Amino acid sequence: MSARRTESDIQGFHATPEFGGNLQKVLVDLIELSLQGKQAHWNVVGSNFRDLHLQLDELVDFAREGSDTIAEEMRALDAVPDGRSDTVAATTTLPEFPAFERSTADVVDLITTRINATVDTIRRVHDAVDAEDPSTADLLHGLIDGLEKQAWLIRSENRKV
Amino acid sequence: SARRTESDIQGFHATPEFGGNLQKVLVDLIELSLQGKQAHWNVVGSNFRDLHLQLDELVDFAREGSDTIAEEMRALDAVPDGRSDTVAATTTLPEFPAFERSTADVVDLITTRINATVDTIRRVHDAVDAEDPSTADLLHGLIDGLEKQAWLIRSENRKV
Amino acid sequence: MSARRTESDIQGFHATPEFGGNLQKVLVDLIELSLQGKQAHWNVVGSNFRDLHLQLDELVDFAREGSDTIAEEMRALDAVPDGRSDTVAATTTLPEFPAFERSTADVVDLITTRINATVDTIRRVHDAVDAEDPSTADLLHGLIDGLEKQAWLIRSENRKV
Amino acid sequence: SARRTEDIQGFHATPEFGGNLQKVLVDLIELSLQGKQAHWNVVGSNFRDLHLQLDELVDFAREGSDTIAEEMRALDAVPDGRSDTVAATTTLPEFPAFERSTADVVDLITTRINATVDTIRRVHDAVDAEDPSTADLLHGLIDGLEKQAWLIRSENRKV
Amino acid sequence: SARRTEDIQGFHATPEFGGNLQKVLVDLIELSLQGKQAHWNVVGSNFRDLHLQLDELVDFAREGSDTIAEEMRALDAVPDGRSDTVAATTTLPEFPAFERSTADVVDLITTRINATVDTIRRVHDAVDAEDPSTADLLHGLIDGLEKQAWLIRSENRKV
Amino acid sequence: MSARRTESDIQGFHATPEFGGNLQKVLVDLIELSLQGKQAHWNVVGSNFRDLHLQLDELVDFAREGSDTIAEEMRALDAVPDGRSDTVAATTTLPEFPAFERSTADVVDLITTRINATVDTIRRVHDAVDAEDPSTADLLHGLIDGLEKQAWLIRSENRKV
Amino acid sequence: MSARRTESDIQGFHATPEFGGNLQKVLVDLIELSLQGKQAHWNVVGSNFRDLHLQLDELVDFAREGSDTIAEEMRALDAVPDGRSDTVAATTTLPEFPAFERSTADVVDLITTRINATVDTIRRVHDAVDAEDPSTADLLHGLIDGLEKQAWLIRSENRKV
Amino acid sequence: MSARRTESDIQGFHATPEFGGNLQKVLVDLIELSLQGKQAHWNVVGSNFRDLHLQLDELVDFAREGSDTIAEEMRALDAVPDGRSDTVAATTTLPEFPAFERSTADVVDLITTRINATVDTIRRVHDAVDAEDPSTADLLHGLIDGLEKQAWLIRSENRKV
Amino acid sequence: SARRTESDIQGFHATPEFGGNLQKVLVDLIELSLQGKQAHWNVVGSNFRDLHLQLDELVDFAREGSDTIAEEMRALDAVPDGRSDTVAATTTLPEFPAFERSTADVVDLITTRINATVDTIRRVHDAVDAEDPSTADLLHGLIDGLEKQAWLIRSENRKV
Amino acid sequence: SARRTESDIQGFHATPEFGGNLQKVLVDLIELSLQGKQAHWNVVGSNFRDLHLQLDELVDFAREGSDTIAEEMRALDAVPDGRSDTVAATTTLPEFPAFERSTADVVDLITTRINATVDTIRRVHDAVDAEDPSTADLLHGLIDGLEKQAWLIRSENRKV
Amino acid sequence: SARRTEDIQGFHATPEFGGNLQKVLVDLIELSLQGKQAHWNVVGSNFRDLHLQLDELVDFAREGSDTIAEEMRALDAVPDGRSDTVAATTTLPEFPAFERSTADVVDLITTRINATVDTIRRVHDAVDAEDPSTADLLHGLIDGLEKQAWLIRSENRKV
Amino acid sequence: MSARRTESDIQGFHATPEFGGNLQKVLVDLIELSLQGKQAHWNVVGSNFRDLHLQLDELVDFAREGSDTIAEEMRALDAVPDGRSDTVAATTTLPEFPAFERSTADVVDLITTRINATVDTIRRVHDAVDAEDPSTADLLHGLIDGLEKQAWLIRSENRKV
Ligand SMILES: [Cl-]
Ligand SMILES: [Cl-]
Ligand SMILES: [Cl-]
Ligand SMILES: [Cl-]
Ligand SMILES: [Fe+3]
Ligand SMILES: [Fe+3]
Ligand SMILES: [Fe+3]
Ligand SMILES: [Fe+3]
Ligand SMILES: [Fe+3]
Ligand SMILES: [Fe+3]
Ligand SMILES: [Fe+3]
Ligand SMILES: [Fe+3]
Ligand SMILES: [Fe+3]
Ligand SMILES: [Fe+3]
Ligand SMILES: [Fe+3]
Ligand SMILES: [Fe+3]
Ligand SMILES: [Mg+2]
Ligand SMILES: [Mg+2]
Ligand SMILES: [Mg+2]
Ligand SMILES: [Mg+2]
């Protein structure tokens, strides 16, 4: 027992309300992106339907894994996620996805914008998150990178060169 | 030969009532998915791990269900709406709480919301069946999968 | 507005004692089929031993998954399954599998007949089950179909020109 | 003491029922064959997606024909999936020879899927009246085929 | 030039040996059946864990009964796994009807596992005397069953 | 220095109408073999039903992969395959599979003969294919070999002492 | 305190020349069984060809894994296996597999007898092996059991009523 | 060779003794956590045994992967890990795990504390590690995050709300 | 017995011409792999995703091909050279552009380079076959795999 | 019927000697696992990679072995002690060095420690077998697996 | 109307062809057996790599012998893979008894591989003249064996 | 729409030319390492050939995954990778790999040096990359770590202690 600590209830790292609130911002935009991604996935029609249909599902998978990661990171640090529909709708920073069928070209533009807005949210909270907890900032880096890849893979469809 | 001669043979498309009925199922499946994840993250207390894990299985089922329903709508020329605003505005499920809840409370809350979702499907079933027997089979899969989840979750709180 | 329902104790579907009794009839014949299937699997000898030995295991697998499905369907709707040995022996409608070794030819006829009997039971309860709960009838259809396929794959050994 | 005593008689179907499944079988096989034809010969804008989706259509149609033929055998009917029979009795419009543009293939194949679904819907009630289990297999065929129709046709859809 | 010359005679076992394996077989089958009964009907605190563990018990017991019946056949004995025989000759206390609490299921099932192990231990030496290889299969059964007993009983254990 | 070629429209290998016609002959017999294989698979009854039923599916699988390979080889070299039902029926060299159920023994002889016929076709076109394009002849060798193996595995049921 | 042993060259278990000679007897009969199993697998014709052809490969697989196990057990205890063709032919106790094709019925009897002989060898060395090294006897039990199961699965083709 | 370096023995990045020593601290606490996790895994008894039994194994897997990663990171940077039992016991900062069977409730509390102490160690060395080698700090982030998740998944059992 | 008596039985080794011919195939396969990845990253426009993905399949094929050829050389006592300098200096493929290119342009460019690679193999085939029929079979696999890729890529740009 | 009538049928439990004997096996398996990893990380020199990899296979075997033994103890109502302090205090294996060691040295060191571990098991085997034949079978698996590892490792250093 | 009419005659091979495949078969089997012998008995520097590579050699040789024997059967020839025949008719130099050093095993096995390839190359043209498809199987054998020779021999190679 | 942004073409993060140029440096050295790794993999001969042969392939896999990641990161941020052979050769910082067969000992030394030079390149651009885009620096950390592990696993062969 020469180097053993004797404490009996050694506590874990707890997030400040500011940190919790910052992760909460990331969470709602990821959930909203997931819902908008499926909406697009179902309702996309026209030239190169299948590619975008499939790519959109891949986007949804990434955003769903991301939201779960963020929420669980909140839980680990004693924060309480709110991913309920009312909260997501009232607090998301993403512009609303339109109703009805939309062309591949329009879906490409719309979805790219909503991905970009989601990355924006993460980049906006990044420094405050990093300052409090360097480990959580790494999760943010993974999210930024995966989302920016999705953005590139989707937007390239509409590129005119 | 017995070969048909038409060049643009049309598919079966759904009445607006039919689309409407599938839309009802769609929003409650999505809401159940979002509430399931909320419960999955925020459940605490006795037998946490079992419920944490089972709630994830409920979410998996509800998500594939919602995707199935929306794609059923699309095949039949209907247009699903799974957006957050629409879901919050039109879901029939009682709202899930925002905060930590005990395993016992989560079991009771989630069972109710599963039952509410099954009820939506049971309420539209006959009108769906009358228009398209094939789509009713999809509804049967949802009822049974969800009723199974309800049993697997609720049994935690069952007395002797 | 809000379409959200108010009740905190929203009830699940309520199943009649007749419904439970009907699935119970299906349950015991599937369990009995599985037990007889293994008996045949172990005790078959003669021309084309290996094929029947193998097919009999596939039948057992289907029948085991079936009985579990039925029993869980009972539980979901607050019925209480009884798959105990005494009850299966006392209430199965299948003729008993004979003791000791049986020829491939005889095993073919016997097991085909036991599948016929098992399907007969499902057909006997079908209409009453479908009227009360169409979703459960769908599971019955899955059972009927898988079993009829097993009967075809087994019985065709004995069919001539 | 609940054990029945007799062979307890096996499975059988009316010749009308068998003929109804036979109608479904030939169109599934024709669809599979036309599907591969389209798969090989499609050219042009968004070739790859259609080439791939058409193979998924063929897979579904092949599994379907198996399911129907096996259902026929289970109930002691006897399927006919031979080339001569399929060509003589299929209700599907003939697939054209030669290469076809992606846009043309989309319209052609959507029609042939729809014709296949039509056949299933045509026999459905007569099949259901004799065997509700068989009807469920028809429901699975309708659903999978109508999904393929949606996934294929969406390429040409203007909004 | 070491090659033997005669059919060199096949495998066989005494009727006493076959009867000893038959005792093990019926209790494994009974255990499997009671296991599923428990699996379906357990309710209450920590339902899910027990529901899942009981299925793992059933898997082990089913594979075991196969192993024993196949061992019997390999040595030209003839197993009896029929419902009537299992019910008439099993040594396991009957599993009760109806739903049972997790705590009650834990105690009930632990006892039935222990009774199954008892049967294996009872015939072990007689089996070993005739065939040491068969005894090894019995050792595998004892070990897997005693592990299941530990994994199940631990739920009720107070320290 | 630079060994790099200058042309921007470097042409692929150019195949004669005779080459396409030769693979077309192979294509229709493989498709016909696959259709007859399924017919036999469904309609075989009698002693050793299960083994033949299973082996026939393996044959169908090989023949289906084969026909796809041949058709794609045609496309690669700008030939246009025709695998449509009418053409297969009108141009296959295989004797037609008889209607209705057939005994295991009869199915063995029939299907073995249809494999023999299919291999015969490949052998008939082989030399002309090999002279124009050795790479394609290699694929023919793969086909011949897999089919001969299928003939062995099926026909040996009927071979005596 | 310290229960740690002092020696730097702690010896492994030392096996008698008799032990090695005993496993060598097992080794050659397993290799011979594997070679005869393949011979039968290739050369069997007649009623139920496919089942026996398949089962014979499973036997070969078991016998090959067995011989490798035995040889490695020899190496672990500083015995030196000899699995060379000349030694196997000169020292195997199995009757030789006859040349040319054999009927399914004959192959059944022959191979069953060769399994019987292989198990006989293991039984002959068993007691001496168990007395010197119980761990090795356990591996012998695994071999005996797998082989007896193979004999059952093969021989039952020829058993009547 | 226009941009090619001409050096023949280009050396890799070498850890300072301070860096090596910091990784060594992480290593022993991860190994100790792994040993204590198994001790708990075997000896946990009572309400919700199975869940904790399984979750504890998942903790052990993570800590074992972690220790291997840390040790290999030391090796790559020319440091020499010491993961021997004597060293771990003499130098771990974790309080000793008690002997004997312990209740689920007590195991939950004990293990949470030891996870927290392990995270503490990593957080204590984090900044010094980051300053010398940003890449290694990322490995630390992965460890912190995985361990804090485990803490949450374990401790939630005892949460009273 | 029929057992041979030699202790150091030699393997078949290739002439310098044979090694040379395989070296030619090797550099064009490597160059095709590098150009395929360039195109994979930099393709933009209509039907991007399909081409992005197909180009990766081309790269996978060309890489396993180059590895096969080099290992064929090694087995026959020849020494492959797959280094960047050698590849740039000796490849027969027209250079791929540095920048973003449209899907239509990438289809045309890549088809040409695949065809150039097949041409190299077809040009060495007969001399390879004459020395070692077994190695020609490897060449056949490369020709057919690459010609398949050419078809799958080029079809995007095909008129009615 | 032949059904037994008791409600709380007891399982076989081990004597303290039996538990003690399994405890002896447990600590040497754990110590071997820790020493195996030490050797795995710190081995350097000729044929490093083979030994690095083989030592990991030894560790995998020893870990599943220790888990098996501890769970055997638990089933029989004995209480394992696998804690670091207990392992260091009671293991019979000679201590592994702290620093880099050559492949040749690591082969010799690890072979000795494997042999020491097998010896512990062989020393308790007969008393274990006498009380519980089923547990002796587990011991046989450990002896053979470890003796296999000893052969696979030691062979590196074997003369002509 | 292109359908042929007769059984259309089955596959067959000349006895010379069958004998040529028989030569390949025995050396593949001998190689497999010597391969395992080497695999078990190799000791010394870089033991593990050689132990593992030799097993990969055995796998290839076993699959090869299967391919050849099955080819023989497909064309209605009758293989002989029995121990007595292999030992009496193999062209491979005998593998020595006892443990051998890694360096010696490398040289020994490389020679036996080369001898096996020699046999395949020896019969190749005669086989090809009757059946070009069979020759392709021989090409696959040559290629896989020559790769194994390279992977094994490289251990002893000095540059 | 209470928190929803109203922007319609929200743009993504764009790399500066400096950032693009820095990733371009990493890219060419990874590609060059991949080509040199294969060259070594084919041409290594002598003592412990097989180990190095296999380890070199593992190095190539890692460097190939790395180059693809770097290039795709450039694409996501609107930079245009150049991985063409001419560019790689003209701009790589790695010393040339020699022609011809080389001993295991020489290959170990040569390859270790080229790995070290590749890590050097990444470490040289690290800070400038981190300053502009923290998320991309994490990808660099993964590359450094994986490469330094490979270096250790390769170089240890030649270590004399
Ligand atoms: Cl795709
Ligand atoms: Cl089979
Ligand atoms: Cl669980
Ligand atoms: Cl290796
Ligand atoms: Fe989660
Ligand atoms: Fe979808
Ligand atoms: Fe269940
Ligand atoms: Fe079928
Ligand atoms: Fe069994
Ligand atoms: Fe295709
Ligand atoms: Fe081995
Ligand atoms: Fe490691
Ligand atoms: Fe390679
Ligand atoms: Fe465990
Ligand atoms: Fe074979
Ligand atoms: Fe990529
Ligand atoms: Mg639990
Ligand atoms: Mg058979
Ligand atoms: Mg596309
Ligand atoms: Mg090595």
Automatic annotation (TrEMBL), chains D, E, K:
Binding site for Fe(2+) 2: D136
Domain Ferritin/DPS span(s) in chain numbering: 20-154
InterPro entries: DPS_DNA-bd, DPS_DNA-bd_CS, Ferritin-like, Ferritin-like_SF, Ferritin_DPS_dom
Ligand binding (Fe(2+) 1): H39, D55, D66, E70
Example of a GO MF term: ferric iron binding
Binding annotation for Mg(2+) 1: N46, D49
Keywords for this protein: DNA-binding, Metal-binding
Binding-site list for Mg(2+) 2: D136
Gene3D superfamilies: 1.20.1260.10
Residues involved in Fe(3+) binding: H39, D55, D66, E70
Coiled-coil features, chain-numbered ranges: none
Protein family according to the UniProt entry: Belongs to the Dps family.
Name of the protein in its database record: Starvation-inducible DNA-binding protein or fine tangled pili major subunit
Annotated source species: Mycolicibacterium smegmatis (strain ATCC 700084 / mc(2)155) (Mycobacterium smegmatis)
